[PDB]
Amino acid sequence: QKRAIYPGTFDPITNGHIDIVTRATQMFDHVILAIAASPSKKPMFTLEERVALAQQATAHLGNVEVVGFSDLMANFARNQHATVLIRGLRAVADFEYEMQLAHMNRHLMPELESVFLMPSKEWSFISSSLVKEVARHQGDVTHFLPENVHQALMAKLA
Amino acid sequence: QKRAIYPGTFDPITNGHIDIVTRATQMFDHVILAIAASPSKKPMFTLEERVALAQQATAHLGNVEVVGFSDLMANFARNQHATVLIRGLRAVADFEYEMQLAHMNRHLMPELESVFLMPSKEWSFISSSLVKEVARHQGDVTHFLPENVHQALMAKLA
Amino acid sequence: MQKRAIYPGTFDPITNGHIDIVTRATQMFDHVILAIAASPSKKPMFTLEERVALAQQATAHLGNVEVVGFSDLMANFARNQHATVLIRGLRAVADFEYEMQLAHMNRHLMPELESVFLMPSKEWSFISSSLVKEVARHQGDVTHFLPENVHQALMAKLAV
Amino acid sequence: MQKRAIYPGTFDPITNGHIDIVTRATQMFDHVILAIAASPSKKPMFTLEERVALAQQATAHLGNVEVVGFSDLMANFARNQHATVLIRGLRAVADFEYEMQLAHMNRHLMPELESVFLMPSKEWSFISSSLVKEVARHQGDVTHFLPENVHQALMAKLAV
Amino acid sequence: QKRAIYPGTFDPITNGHIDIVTRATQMFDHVILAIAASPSKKPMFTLEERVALAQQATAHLGNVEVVGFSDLMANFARNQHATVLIRGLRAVADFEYEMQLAHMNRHLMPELESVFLMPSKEWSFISSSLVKEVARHQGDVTHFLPENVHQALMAKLA
Amino acid sequence: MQKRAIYPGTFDPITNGHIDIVTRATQMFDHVILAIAASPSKKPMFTLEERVALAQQATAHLGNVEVVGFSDLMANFARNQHATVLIRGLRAVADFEYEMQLAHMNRHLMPELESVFLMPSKEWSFISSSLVKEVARHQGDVTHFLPENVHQALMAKLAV
Ligand SMILES: Oc1cccc2nc(C(F)(F)F)[nH]c12
Ligand SMILES: Oc1cccc2nc(C(F)(F)F)[nH]c12
Ligand SMILES: Oc1cccc2nc(C(F)(F)F)[nH]c12
Ligand SMILES: Oc1cccc2nc(C(F)(F)F)[nH]c12
Ligand SMILES: Oc1cccc2nc(C(F)(F)F)[nH]c12
Ligand SMILES: Oc1cccc2nc(C(F)(F)F)[nH]c12
C-alpha cells in the first residue's frame, strides 16, 4: 500500500489539478489531495469551500481522499503515513520554487519523496490565479474548470 | 487597415513602453495603447492619470490612440476591431507569464494574434515598478521617463 | 502599409510547428517569404532543394507565401528582399535567450528590420525539427508533427 | 500496484548523482530497470559493456534494480519491458526545458508510460557526467562524485 | 583599503546571508552589511531588530560593520565610500531581478561595481521568506539560522 | 589585501565584452591575469599565440593586467598562479546555469579560490565570441563589438 500526498492551495481546483491527481492515482494506491489553509495567500475561497469543491470534482476517482490542513505539509504527510509528495511541473518559474520547497521538505522529513508530474499540453499554461483574473472580467472559463467549480466561481463573483 | 492593441497597466508609462509603441506604429496602421484599470495591482496613478500621461507622452506619434479599459482585454481588443495584440519582451521571467496570457487570449479570441516586440538594450532592464522604487528614494529617474511623466511622478511623491 | 515579412530557418524538415507560425504570419502581413538557409555548419538531413520542395508543397494553400533558399547572412537576405519584418517562432525559455541575442544582432546589422515573435499552438510548443528527426531515426512515430508530404519524404530518407 | 519503472540514460560514467536518483526510485517502485543507451551519436568514453558492468557493481546493494542495455527508442524499450513509469532526474532550469520536450514526446509515443521527475541531493545538484569527464580529462579530482569502482575504471581509462 | 557594501532586507538574516558576508570579508578589507528599511516588503522584524540580529550574528567577523538605511542604496554606498556592491546569486529567478538592480545602480553610481557571490550548496535553496513560512507552521528551522536569530524568530511567532 | 585575480576563457577572439569585464576587474583587484585556454576540444578560429597577442595589444592600456596562456584545468592554473579570485562575466540566464555548475566544481577543486561574477555594460550583454564569429563568417559587420586590432586580424583571417 503506497500512499501519496498532493498538497496545494487549490483556490480553486482546476482541470490542471484534476489532470495531476488522476496521473497520481494511476501510479499510487492511495492519493490524499491535501488543501493548505494558506491565509498568507488571502484565498478567494475558504478552506471548507475548497475542500467541498475538490471532493465533488474528484468523486469519480475512487482512490482520492480530500482533506484540509493548516499544519506544516511535512508533518501532515507524516501524519497521513505518506511517503510520496506529488507536485505538478508546468514551467521554469514554478520549478525554481518547487526545488526550494522539496529541499526544505527533505530536511523536515527525509523519507518523504517529492515527485513531479507533468500536466497535459492542454493545462500547461493555466493557474488558479489566471482563471480567477479572466473570471473577475466575466471571461469564459468553463473550459478550465470542473462544472461544480465553474458554477461556484460564477456565484462567488456575482 | 491593420489595427493593433498594446495593452498594459502603464503605471506609469516609461521610455521602455514608448520604445515598444513606436516599433508597433512602424509595423501597423493604427495602434491602440490600452491602459488596464488593474485595481488588483493597487496602481500608484488612477486610470485617468495614466491615460492623460500616456496621451501626452505619445502625442508626437500620429497613429497612436490612448484608451483606458476595465474590460477583459480580449473583449476590448474585439470591440476595438484589433487583430494584433502587442506585448514587449524584456527577459525570461516576463516571457513565462506572457505565454500564459497569450494562450488564454487565444482561447478567448482565436483571430487575435499576440506578437512580441523586443525593446532596445537601453530599456531592457527597467520596469514601472523599478522606476517607482528609485523615485520613492529620491533617485534620479529622468533618463527612464518622458518629461511629463517624470514631472507627474515627482509631484505624486511630494 | 504593404508589409514584406521574412520567416527564416533551416526547416530540416518543415514541421506542423513551422506551418502554424507561417500561417499566423500570413494573417497579419501582406507578403511572407519563408526563407530556407543553406545551413552547411549544421549538416542537414535534407538537401536545400528537398527542403525548398517540401516547404513549397506544404504551404501551397497559402497564397501570400513565397518559399526561397538563401546562403547569405539572414539580415543581408532580408535587406535585399526589402523585408521590414523578421518572423521568429517562440516556443519556450531556452530558445528565448538565444532569440534576444539574435534579435539584438539583427537590429545592429539592419535597424530597419523589426523582429516579431509569434507563438505556436500549445500542440506544437514542445517539438523541434531536431527532436522529430531523432525520434524518427530511432523508429518512433512522428506522423502527427509533420505535413503529409514531409512524412512521406522522411520515411523514404530513413529507409535508405 | 506492482509497478515497473525504467531509469534510462547514457550513464557515461554512472555518477553518485545517478546512484542517488536510482536509490530514491527503488524506495517508491517495486522494480527499477536502470537502462543504458548504446548512444552512438554522443560517442561515449566507456563502451556499453563497460557502462553496464560499472552500473551493475555500483547498484548491487539495491535488490530491486536491474541493469540493462538498449539501442531502441527509450519509449519502444519501456513498452517492451512493460514499464509504466519513466524516471527522470531533475537538477536545474536548463535541463528542465528539454525534459518537458522529452516528456511530451514520450507521452505521444507511449501514453501509458508516466514521466516522473525525482530530485537529487543538493550534494549532486550541480554535476553531470559531462562535467565530471571534462575535469578528470584535465587532471582534476572527481573522486567525490563517483562510486569507487567507477573512480578506478576512469583513472585506468584516462591513463591510456 | 577596499570597501564593499552588502545590501538587503535581511528579514531575518540567515546562514545563507552569513555565508555570503563571510566570503565578502575574505575578498575585501571592510564589508558594510547594509540593512534596507524596506517598508514596501512589510517586514516581520523592525529595522532596529534586524540590525541587532545581524550585529550579533556577525560579531565573530572583525571586518563586518552592520548599519540600517532608508536611503537609495546607491547614495548609501556613495556615503559609505564603498566601490563594491555584493549580492548573493542562488538561482535563475533572483539573477533576472539582480541584473535590473545592478544596471539601475550602475546608472546612479557608475564607479560602484556590483559583484555576485555564490553561496554554498547548503544554502542554495533557502530564503528568509521560506524560513519564516516553515517557522509560522512550527517547523524546525534551527539548521538555517544563527542561534540568536532562531531564538528571536521563535519569540516573535509566540 | 593584495589580491590576485584570474579571468579565464578561450577569448576566440577577445571582444569589447571581455575588455569591459577585465577593465571592471582591474578597478577592484590589484593584479588581474587574463588567462587564455589552449581549448583544443572547441577547435579555435585563432591559434593560442594569435589569441594571446590580440589580448595583449587590446589590454596594453591596463597596467595591472597580465595576458597568459594555459593548458591545465583552470583551477590547477589559478592555484599555481596564487590567485584567490576567479572572474566570470555574467551576461544572461542561459549561461548562469552552467556558471553555477562551473563555480561549484571550482569550489570543490580549489576551496581557497572565490568565484566572482561581474556584469558587462548593457552594450555587450547580448553578444558572444561565437555569435560575432558566425556573423563575420557570413559577411556581417562586427566592427562595433571588437577592439580595432581584433577587427583587423579577423578580416585577415576570413579573407584566407
Ligand atoms: O512542509 C513545508 C516546507 C516548506 C514550506 C511549507 N509551507 C507549508 C504550509 F504552508 F503549511 F503548507 N508547509 C511547508
Ligand atoms: O483577456 C485576458 C486574458 C487573460 C487575463 C486577462 N486579464 C485581463 C484584464 F485584467 F482585464 F486586463 N484581461 C485578460
Ligand atoms: O542575420 C544573422 C544574425 C546573427 C547570426 C546569423 N546567422 C545567420 C545565417 F546563418 F547566415 F543565417 N544569419 C544571422
Ligand atoms: O523515447 C524518446 C523520446 C524522444 C527522444 C528520444 N531519443 C531516444 C533514444 F536516443 F533512442 F534513447 N529515445 C527517445
Ligand atoms: O539604489 C537603488 C537602485 C534600484 C532600486 C533601489 N531600491 C533601493 C532601496 F529600496 F532604497 F533599497 N535603492 C535602490
Ligand atoms: O577548473 C575547471 C572546472 C570545471 C571544468 C573545467 N574545464 C577547465 C578547462 F577546460 F581545462 F579550462 N577548467 C575547469
Side-chain angles (χ1 to χ4, degrees), chain B residues 98-151:
Chain B
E98 290 306 321
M99 288 203 288
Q100 295 192 327
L101 171 68
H103 282 295
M104 185 52 74
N105 279 326
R106 193 172 281 158
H107 177 82
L108 301 155
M109 190 177 166
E111 74 275 21
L112 179 67
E113 276 302 327
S114 287
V115 319
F116 302 91
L117 302 178
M118 185 197 58
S120 70
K121 294 187 292 309
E122 199 61 30
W123 320 120
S124 289
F125 301 94
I126 72 152
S127 63
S128 287
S129 166
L130 186 64
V131 171
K132 283 182 289 189
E133 185 172 344
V134 173
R136 280 199 302 276
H137 287 98
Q138 298 75 55
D140 190 333
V141 293
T142 52
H143 181 64
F144 311 108
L145 297 173
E147 185 204 81
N148 69 296
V149 178
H150 175 262
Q151 286 173 36

Side-chain angles (χ1 to χ4, degrees), chain D residues 1 9 21 27 33 44 49 59 63 65 78 83-85 101 105 113 120 127 144 148 156 159-160:
Chain D
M1 294 181 216
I21 298 291
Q27 287 166 21
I33 304 152
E49 320 91 270
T59 60
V65 173
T84 57
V85 178
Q101 286 196 352
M105 182 53 77
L113 181 66
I127 62 146
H144 177 69
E148 171 59 22
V160 299

Side-chain angles (χ1 to χ4, degrees), chain C residues 28-41 44-100:
Chain C
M28 69 191 98
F29 302 119
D30 308 282
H31 189 69
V32 181
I33 304 152
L34 188 155
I36 312 196
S39 69
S41 72
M45 172 177 275
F46 293 94
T47 75
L48 184 69
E49 320 91 270
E50 287 177 324
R51 284 183 280 142
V52 171
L54 295 175
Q56 282 189 329
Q57 268 149 31
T59 60
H61 63 293
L62 303 163
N64 61 329
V65 173
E66 192 189 342
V67 179
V68 175
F70 76 105
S71 58
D72 216 329
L73 186 67
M74 84 176 79
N76 289 345
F77 183 61
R79 185 179 307 101
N80 286 355
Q81 282 304 302
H82 308 111
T84 57
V85 178
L86 163 55
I87 306 290
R88 301 294 297 172
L90 248 184
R91 300 172 309 224
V93 162
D95 54 77
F96 177 84
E97 289 280 281
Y98 173 74
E99 287 301 335
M100 300 306 104

